[PDB]
Structure 1
Amino acid sequence: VMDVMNRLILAMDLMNRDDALRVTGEVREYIDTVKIGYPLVLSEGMDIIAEFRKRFGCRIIADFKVADIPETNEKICRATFKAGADAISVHGFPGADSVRACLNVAEEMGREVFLLTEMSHPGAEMFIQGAADEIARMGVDLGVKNYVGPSTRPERLSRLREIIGQDSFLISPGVGAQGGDPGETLRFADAIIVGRSIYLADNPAAAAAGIIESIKDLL
């Protein structure tokens, strides 16, 4: 499975190229995996992925939460992987055919799919939470190996780990800004995703170092 340095993935959701590159540079010694989403890509373009690879050599997860019909999902993944992304996130709610479409392209291009199971925000309780266990089982049936689950609900994160098994790889956003605890989250997740607590910090480097200090026993 993916080996994430310090079990810490930077969510780089700044929307200015100079700021994104500066801040990522400031925390580069602590990470080797950056999650890039639509806030940055739609503001600066898909070439920003190649630029991160050129500058940092970091692994890039494109957090695009692909959620279309199969035919369109295929096109989105192709474009995304052409841009240099190592992995892409995919919603499970739209069903198995939509997920399989992404799995196909990933296999073809030597990339990874991360299946989003339950989201960490309050609205996730309305529809997603009630489908989340079934979505995880669907992932298992499909041979999905990488999953995303909620730091803000450690009991749900734990259940999701139970479903997918210890061999699957699980990452978790919602740490810090949204209320999730780094150490508690790493009881169940392989790696935590952290955005604002780092990139909005007066001193991002000290922010990252602080978080890592707090989980040092968990490596």
Structure 2
Amino acid sequence: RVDVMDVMNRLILAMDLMNRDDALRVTGEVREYIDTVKIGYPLVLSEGMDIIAEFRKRFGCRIIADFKVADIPETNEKICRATFKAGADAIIVHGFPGADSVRACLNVAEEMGREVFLLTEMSHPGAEMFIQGAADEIARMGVDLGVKNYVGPSTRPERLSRLREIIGQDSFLISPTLRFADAIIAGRSIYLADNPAAAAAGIIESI
């Protein structure tokens, strides 16, 4: 789809290491394979938001800020603005806090020419308590708000088909499979590999 992002090789690196030296070393080594890197709070709180601009300038990669934004609208707006000002191309936001909290993010994204990804579901054990039961309604809420980018369940293929049914064939879907998701996310498989470059190469082959 022309109107959603192109992720090189359909493979996103989840750069979840917390020290800047290690994080930079891995990302540069895989830049030939991956052009899209997802960073979260462990790295940015440890090293500073300046690390976002550093990844973009050193590797020319797209950055998705996996900040799971989950506050009231006014605070969500400020979080998004700070994150986009730091150079993030996109931000991941929770749907559980409701439509006006998501819309606040959409507003800033439109102002600044950036992207919002709605997190529809999570796959860790405790996700059963509240998140799983809300997932379809959260996805529908996204569709109704014109959300174009979604983060889906890590496990359960049949969950991806259901999400794809709700969001349509045009929207962009990433999952931590490629029959339904546009790109997959790899973390440890790569950054804990002795040869991250080789690891990335291998995943790409099977893709």
TM-score, normalised relative to structure 1 = 0.91
State, as a whole percentage, how many aligned pairs show the same letter: 99
Q: Match of 1:30, SS?
A: coil
Question: Offset at 1:143?
Answer: 0.5
2:54 is aligned to 51
Q: Match of 1:28, SS?
A: coil
Contact 1:33 1:59 (C-alpha < 8 Å) held by counterparts: yes
Q: Match of 2:97, SS?
A: coil
Q: Distance in 2 between matches of 1:126 and 1:187?
A: 28
Task: Indicate which of 156, 180, 184 corresponds to 1:188.
Answer: 180
Gaps of 5+ in 1: 174-185
Question: Offset at 1:121?
Answer: 1.5
TM-score, normalised relative to structure 2 = 0.97
Write the deviation string for residues 153-204 of structure 1: whole angstroms up to 9, x where unpaired.
Answer: 111111001100010000011xxxxxxxxxxxx1110000111110011111
Task: Indicate which of 97, 102, 109 corresponds to 2:100.
Answer: 97
Q: Give aligned pairs, total.
A: 203
Q: Does 1:17 align with 2:9?
A: no
Q: Match of 1:48, SS?
A: helix
Gaps of 5+ in 2: none
Q: Could you say what the CA RMSD is over the residues aligned between the two structures, in angstroms?
A: 0.7
Contact 1:136 1:164 (C-alpha < 8 Å) held by counterparts: yes
Question: Offset at 1:82?
Answer: 0.4
Q: Distance in 2 between matches of 1:146 and 1:203?
A: 31
Q: Distance in 1 between matches of 2:156 and 2:70?
A: 23
Question: Offset at 1:151?
Answer: 2.7
Q: Does 1:29 align with 2:32?
A: yes
Question: Offset at 1:109?
Answer: 0.3
Question: Offset at 1:126?
Answer: 1.5
Contact 1:116 1:149 (C-alpha < 8 Å) held by counterparts: yes
Q: Match of 1:151, SS?
A: coil
Contact 1:171 1:189 (C-alpha < 8 Å) held by counterparts: yes
Write the deviation string for residues 126-169 of structure 1: whole angstroms up to 9, x where unpaired.
Answer: 11110000000000100000000013111111100110001000
Task: Indicate which of 116, 120, 134 corresponds to 1:117.
Answer: 120
Question: Offset at 1:123?
Answer: 1.7
Question: Offset at 1:25?
Answer: 1.1
Q: Match of 1:170, SS?
A: strand
Which portions of structure 1, spanning 4 or more consecutive aligned residues, are displaced by more than 4 angstroms?
none
Task: Indicate which of 120, 125, 137 corresponds to 2:140.
Answer: 137
Q: Does 1:149 align with 2:141?
A: no
Q: Match of 1:89, SS?
A: strand
Contact 1:100 1:142 (C-alpha < 8 Å) held by counterparts: yes
Question: Offset at 1:120?
Answer: 2.0
Contact 1:120 1:149 (C-alpha < 8 Å) held by counterparts: no
Q: Distance in 2 between matches of 1:121 and 1:208?
A: 24
Write the deviation string for residues 50-109 of structure 1: whole angstroms up to 9, x where unpaired.
Answer: 101110110010010000000100000010000000000000000001000000000000
